[PDB]
Design an enzyme around this catalytic site. Sequence first.
Site, mmCIF file in Angstrom:
data_model
loop_
_atom_site.group_PDB
_atom_site.id
_atom_site.type_symbol
_atom_site.label_atom_id
_atom_site.label_comp_id
_atom_site.label_asym_id
_atom_site.label_seq_id
_atom_site.Cartn_x
_atom_site.Cartn_y
_atom_site.Cartn_z
ATOM 1 N N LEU A 1 4.443 6.750 -9.055
ATOM 2 C CA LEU A 1 4.923 5.531 -8.428
ATOM 3 C C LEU A 1 5.457 4.553 -9.462
ATOM 4 C CD1 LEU A 1 2.086 5.202 -5.838
ATOM 5 C CD2 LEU A 1 4.352 6.150 -5.554
ATOM 6 N N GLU B 1 15.121 -16.882 12.207
ATOM 7 C CA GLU B 1 15.495 -15.617 11.572
ATOM 8 C C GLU B 1 15.839 -15.726 10.086
ATOM 9 O OE1 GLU B 1 15.548 -12.772 13.583
ATOM 10 O OE2 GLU B 1 15.849 -11.500 11.822
ATOM 11 N N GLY C 1 9.226 -12.675 10.953
ATOM 12 C CA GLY C 1 8.389 -13.686 11.566
ATOM 13 C C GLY C 1 7.599 -14.382 10.487
ATOM 14 N N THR D 1 4.456 -14.259 10.399
ATOM 15 C CA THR D 1 3.245 -13.469 10.267
ATOM 16 C C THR D 1 3.151 -12.792 8.918
ATOM 17 O OG1 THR D 1 3.376 -12.993 12.620
ATOM 18 C CG2 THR D 1 1.902 -11.650 11.280
ATOM 19 N N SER E 1 6.883 -7.760 7.385
ATOM 20 C CA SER E 1 8.198 -8.055 7.927
ATOM 21 C C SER E 1 8.646 -9.440 7.503
ATOM 22 C CB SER E 1 8.200 -7.974 9.454
ATOM 23 O OG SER E 1 7.872 -6.671 9.889
ATOM 24 N N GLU F 1 7.109 5.397 -12.029
ATOM 25 C CA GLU F 1 8.442 5.838 -12.406
ATOM 26 C C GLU F 1 9.507 5.241 -11.509
ATOM 27 O OE1 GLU F 1 9.071 7.440 -15.167
ATOM 28 O OE2 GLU F 1 6.918 7.300 -15.557
#
Lengths: 323, 426, 411
Positions: C224, C155, C115, C117, C112, C226
Amino acid sequence: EEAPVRVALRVRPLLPKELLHGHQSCLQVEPGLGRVTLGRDRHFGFHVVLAEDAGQEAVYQACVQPLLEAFFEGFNATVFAYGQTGSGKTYTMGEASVASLLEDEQGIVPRAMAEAFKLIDENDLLDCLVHVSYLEVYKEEFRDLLEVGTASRDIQLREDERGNVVLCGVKEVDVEGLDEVLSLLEMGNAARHLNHLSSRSHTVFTVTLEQRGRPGQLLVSKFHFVDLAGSERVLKTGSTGERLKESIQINSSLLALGNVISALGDPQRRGSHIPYRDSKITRILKDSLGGNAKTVMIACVSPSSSDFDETLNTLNYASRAQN
Amino acid sequence: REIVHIQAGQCGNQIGAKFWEVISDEHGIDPTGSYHGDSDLQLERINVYYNEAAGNKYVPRAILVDLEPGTMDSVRSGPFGQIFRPDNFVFGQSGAGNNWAKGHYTEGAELVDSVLDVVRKESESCDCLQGFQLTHSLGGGTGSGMGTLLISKIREEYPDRIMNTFSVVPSPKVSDTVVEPYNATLSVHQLVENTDETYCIDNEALYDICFRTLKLTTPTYGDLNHLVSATMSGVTTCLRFPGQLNADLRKLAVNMVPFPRLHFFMPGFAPLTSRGSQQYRALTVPELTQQMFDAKNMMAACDPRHGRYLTVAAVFRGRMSMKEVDEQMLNVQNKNSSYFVEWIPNNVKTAVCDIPPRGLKMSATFIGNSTAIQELFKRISEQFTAMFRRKAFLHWYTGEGMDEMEFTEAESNMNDLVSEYQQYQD
Amino acid sequence: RECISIHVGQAGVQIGNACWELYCLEHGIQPDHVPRAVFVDLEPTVIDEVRTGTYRQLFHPEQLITGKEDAANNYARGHYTIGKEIIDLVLDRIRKLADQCTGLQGFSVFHSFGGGTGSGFTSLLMERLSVDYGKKSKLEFSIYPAPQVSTAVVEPYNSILTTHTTLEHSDCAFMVDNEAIYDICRRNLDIERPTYTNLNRLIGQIVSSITASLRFDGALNVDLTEFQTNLVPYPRAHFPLATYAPVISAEKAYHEQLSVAEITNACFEPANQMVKCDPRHGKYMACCLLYRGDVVPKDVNAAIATIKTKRTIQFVDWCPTGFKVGINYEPPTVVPGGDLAKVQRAVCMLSNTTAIAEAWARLDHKFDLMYAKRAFVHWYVGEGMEEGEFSEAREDMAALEKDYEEVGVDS
Ligand SMILES: CC(=O)O[C@H]1C(=O)[C@@]2(C)[C@H]([C@H](OC(=O)c3ccccc3)[C@]3(O)C[C@H](OC(=O)[C@H](O)[C@@H](NC(=O)c4ccccc4)c4ccccc4)C(C)=C1C3(C)C)[C@]1(OC(C)=O)CO[C@@H]1C[C@@H]2O
Ligand SMILES: Nc1nc2c(ncn2[C@@H]2O[C@H](COP(=O)(O)OP(=O)(O)OP(=O)(O)O)[C@@H](O)[C@H]2O)c(=O)[nH]1
Ligand SMILES: Nc1ncnc2c1ncn2[C@@H]1O[C@H](COP(=O)(O)OP(=O)(O)NP(=O)(O)O)[C@@H](O)[C@H]1O
Ligand SMILES: Nc1nc2c(ncn2[C@@H]2O[C@H](COP(=O)(O)OP(=O)(O)O)[C@@H](O)[C@H]2O)c(=O)[nH]1
């Protein structure tokens, strides 16, 4: 009625440890032109540009001695030594360095203290006796470098209703000879904290001489040998381990200081109250910024292209120097 | 994650005694006995506030300090006065000087090391240290002189973890004894440099919430400290239960400060209803929403609407949906957007629990940072320089070695703290 | 070959919980042989979700690498020291799995931007992977921030400092924003209780049709690689838009006229593509369509035709060669507590457009405003960054949005 902050810059000579490894001269040393070319378009303004073969007396007579005359105004004057880690801030003022053969190896500090004893000789009119202090700013904590041990709960600062800053827990010794002055600098530089072995903390040497205005209005004058720290920014590849923790806390204090000094010349979006209180090297230099007190900027850069943008960042230290 | 507890001052015992009422009830703990909570999830991260050294028992990792013994002596006679290992007590039969400096230079000063031995025995007693909870008051010297004396030594000792400051700022008119406000000044002069989170509370706000919104006419002080226990039970170990998005102290520290001046915080708690009269058939996260941001249900002195909002974090406690959270936070970003300062778009910080408290179905936790606290310390400034001018209470502090020059520095430091609050109220 | 992935970040962990759940249901995996991933977080709480109840026995738990230090959602902390203790242990676990698998196919990276993290740990994680396995497949995967439904106070800063270097260490990247998925659950799944775990079942559905079905029995199975050759006309790793179309609920499917052209055409209505930068003016440069179930080619070569012959959903002029289609055979599978309604045909689309730079502008100028007062400098320089890092991030995205700019309208 306010004189602006005088702006000066120094280029260091290049060592063979960077010369033979291929660090090309990314700078263009232009001492007499009052400007310095970087790359092909960066042209900045400086009052005194110092070449990489300059003399410490010429550094002493361009900035310091005009403030030594202004030290007898009974008002403050402040000149620091800025640079990145490895710029030569030790050589810039001339402390923690003992060669004393040509005498150009030591710089401004025996010149201003030797000349200070020269000025005791002439001006025998005003009752004057100089006491100095020599302190450490380390991990945002103080340390009396003139003493082998003093509590951090004792070494705190003060502030009065007049608008000054008073120190506490500081061993103060008067002057009688340059041998005693260099003895205090010797014992203090031995009490500081590889060859420089950290070059980390701020070593602050404050010269204090009150000037008795003529049993009357006391006119206080202080002059400041405030040696700064190295300004490494990018360096993931440098300071590691536990010594990473030594570098990282003062590294926030660096751009804390740069965050302070850049809040004056740019009022474009609600240029708020100046946060001197964020760092302990900034509250001691609140008097050293603006007003009737004097301040002259001198910074030391490197000719190595690897610190190129960092040199420009030092120039970004110098670009926002207004006032 | 592990946090030790500190109760200084004659106020403080209760300041947090009620908290040790609550959280032991939150995990199912008897006055003497064990984990009698029926749910296993009350156990999985209890190490933040607890230890197990007698093994079968439970012990609150807590250090209880006072400069006058009979207060905490009444506490150890209390209903939860047996759940402490009494060797953790550190106190003395000295005169608890109502001077700040007498608790900061002389009396507790020869009891500091006795505290520090217990904070070092308790710090590296177990796994990695996380944070510190400073429960005290500014109302006198006992929570304030020995308080900032403690944590001022602590940050020199530990430059690393988080300093949570439960201060008790005096209410701006409902005083206690009119020698009061100096015990703010010299305390808060050495607060901002030696913490990173300060949750300040105010007394007439407590009477405002307890007396009006709850229709109880008799504000017993244990109910006031019961409400503060709802605050700190709201904040931290709530995040140290399961949570969908569950923050920590450190996230809240990086969130709700602009700068390292840290801009001392103002908490609130959402479900504030009278006892049996408030059957309502409309109790959920949403209510917590509008309930959080009104001029009442605030533990601060000044009206929070009177300035901007820099940063507000919320810790919602209940099985709920973030769409009907973040949509509501968008509503607060819309309908009050004038005093909700623009240049930071996300003044909100979402925090999601997974558990209710013991009986309620859904609760919420307000933590706020406005600009309005400007007209709190200025208030504290205005009384301070008022009867500083007569110099009439100067002898009690000079008699304890505190010197003249300290006061004006405290005035200037708290002063330009207020000035920069004005400079960002905008 | 049955590919082996990573999951850092709390939403990455839970999105692997429901995603990996749908994995371990749709291939007939019993709740008691072989798990095929690793889970990393900077707090053992979120892992102790999975390490406590269901789907605890179904792992060999000697690999769910946790860090008992701070969660630390701030970029410069999560890139530096606090993940430095764990990064090597993660490397040895994934190289052990690299040796145990035979002919590893690629990397799909769930994390993500939201954050610290899964931002800086992800940053030098992908950097360290391209040092290690740079001649492989890199498919990074973060949840893009909401433009106004935002959560973190920092953010921007995690995402902005992440894209400073996460561009140069993956090629294919899928970023999906929350807000339009709330529009889908609110509107077209038609419930007013949108749960994080239901979002996780939706992304777990779309990734559940990216590869596990495409390594299941498909007559037009797609590599993958491709993706990383088809979807980008330039080697500058860009990022497309992926959307799972048949989002009808259980009440909807008394709807006997439901075919491939329905959800095929529904892949291209603008307010359905799970990002809040709809194709109002985004010229499509690439579109890979992956189908499954009993797909009929009549809706293919009538519906896709009338998409391209609509001339209102205008493609890129100078580079219009933007289709790549593959159809799996197997239908999707109903989560027993889920919401999707046992649909006999399904489309997962993805398409790289013009539009995303505008979304980047939604993140960019926002990023500039909190930079404009030098706001959160002391935490990150308190962890090892500087002004020049922020400046290189800003110039980096500044060149990035012009790279997105010139491929589109400029013909
Ligand atoms: C039958 C029933 O549902 O009773 C409720 C109740 O009537 C109400 C009025 C409770 C009640 O709270 C108060 O009256 C109150 C008294 C002094 C100071 C502050 C509040 C309640 O006493 C409080 C109690 O709270 C809890 O159980 C929480 O877990 C809470 N616990 C404590 O504060 C606590 C009290 C005594 C001993 C140990 C702990 C808590 C909240 C946050 C974090 C941790 C714990 C609840 C739901 C109720 C009663 C019992 C009547 C309310 O308060 C709280 C904190 O929940 C007041 O407005 C809410 C709404 C509740 O519905
Ligand atoms: N779509 C979706 N987004 C989520 C979910 N959970 C968290 N997020 C978003 O992800 C952002 C943070 O990313 P996470 O990996 O979940 O949280 P984190 O950074 O790991 O937080 P810590 O676990 O405390 O370190 C939050 O701001 C949320 O907006 C989820 O379940 N679904
Ligand atoms: N302008 C210069 N003139 C003469 N010597 C220099 C100069 N710059 C660097 N040196 C020498 O190269 C070495 C590096 O200088 P040094 O002062 O140690 O770096 P620094 O970052 O300024 N450390 P410090 O002053 O302790 O904060 C020293 O031994 C100097 O003698
Ligand atoms: N919330 C709450 N505040 C209290 C209570 N008792 C006292 N206070 C406040 O806390 C201050 C008392 O601090 P304390 O340590 O007891 O006084 P000191 O011994 O002179 O330092 C007073 O100014 C009161 O306003 C109480 O029971 N609850």
